[PDB]
């Protein structure tokens, strides 16, 4: 019996709200809100807490990190990153929490730093080849993937994907996606890397393609029910959930999950209270 939480976001500005969805009972409730307004952040589940890394507070790009205790229902704040990061990707790999890319917001970032629960400290690792804002990340088989995003240097949305090996500490390009996807919803399900939605300028996609690390090839699956960009993505019990986002104009309150067995996207029977974009999601136990 797991629960899914949605942290912060825009609606239409930075908020503090954090909603929770009970699967067994099909309902959305409010839990302990953030200590501060936060959106465009990286939200991960590192055993056994939920982390909110970087982001935007409606006025400034932040480097702070907040941690949630699903038992006492309260937020505490750990060590802040070295750099301010907004619209970044965050994931866990080999007991390390990586903060990937983001916005300064004077410049797009190619730098990556990792956090250790052991030392409570952020340290830089090898930077990406291309700076990426509005980037999504995923971890497959001890590898860290930075999917698409936006490059301020060349001024265009990216179709390139990079791979990070913690053993060698260097980034390499892999197979480019079928199209340019900025702010795509990135998740991992059954060893497969998913790139959902995203956008290139004003065009928001509902198409989804999936990467196979073994073959280094992208293949297309079923389109989502709706065009989504900047949505929250997490997977649980063989299903990949996509939460909120926006269609380039309006923030969405709908949530849909993907079933790789049947190749289907299914809407949740109950939308969120308030439509959110750039909100992070994670799954814990109640």
């Amino acid at each position: 019996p797991k629960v899914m939480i949605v942290v912060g976001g825009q609606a239409p500005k930075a908020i503090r709200s954090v909603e929770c969805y009970d699967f067994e009972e099909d309902r959305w409730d409010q839990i302990a809100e953030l200590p501060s307004r936060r959106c465009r952040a990286g939200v991960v589940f590192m055993a056994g807490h939920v982390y909110a890394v970087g982001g935007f507070n409606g006025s400034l790009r932040v480097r702070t990190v907040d941690v949630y205790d699903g038992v006492k229902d309260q937020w505490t704040s750990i060590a802040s990153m070295q750099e301010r990061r907004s619209t970044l990707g965050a994931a866990v790999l080999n007991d390390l929490l990586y903060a990937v890319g983001g916005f300064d917001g004077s410049t797009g970032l190619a730098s990556v730093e990792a956090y250790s629960y052991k030392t409570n400290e952020w340290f830089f690792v090898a930077p990406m080849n291309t700076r990426r804002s509005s980037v999504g990340v995923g971890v497959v088989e001890g590898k860290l993937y930075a999917v698409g995003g936006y490059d301020g240097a060349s001024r265009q949305c990216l179709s390139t994907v990079e791979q990070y090996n913690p053993a060698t500490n260097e980034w390499i390009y892999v197979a480019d996606m079928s199209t340019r996807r900025s702010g795509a919803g990135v998740g991992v399900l059954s060893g497969q890397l998913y790139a959902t939605g995203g956008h290139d300028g004003p065009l928001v996609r509902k198409s989804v393609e999936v990467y196979d690390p073994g073959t280094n090839t992208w293949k297309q699956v079923a389109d989502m029910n709706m065009c989504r960009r900047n949505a929250g993505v997490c997977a649980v019990n063989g299903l990949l959930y996509v939460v909120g986002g926006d269609d380039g104009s309006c923030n969405l309150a709908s949530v849909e999950y993907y079933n790789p067995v049947t190749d289907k996207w299914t809407l949740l029977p109950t939308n969120m209270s308030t439509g959110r974009s750039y909100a992070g999601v994670a799954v814990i136990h109640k």
Binding site: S59, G105, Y150
Partner: peptide, 10 residues
């Protein structure tokens, strides 16, 4: 800085 995200500033 600008409230908008980098990609939307474009």
């Amino acid at each position: 800085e600008c409230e908008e995200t980098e990609v939307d500033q474009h």
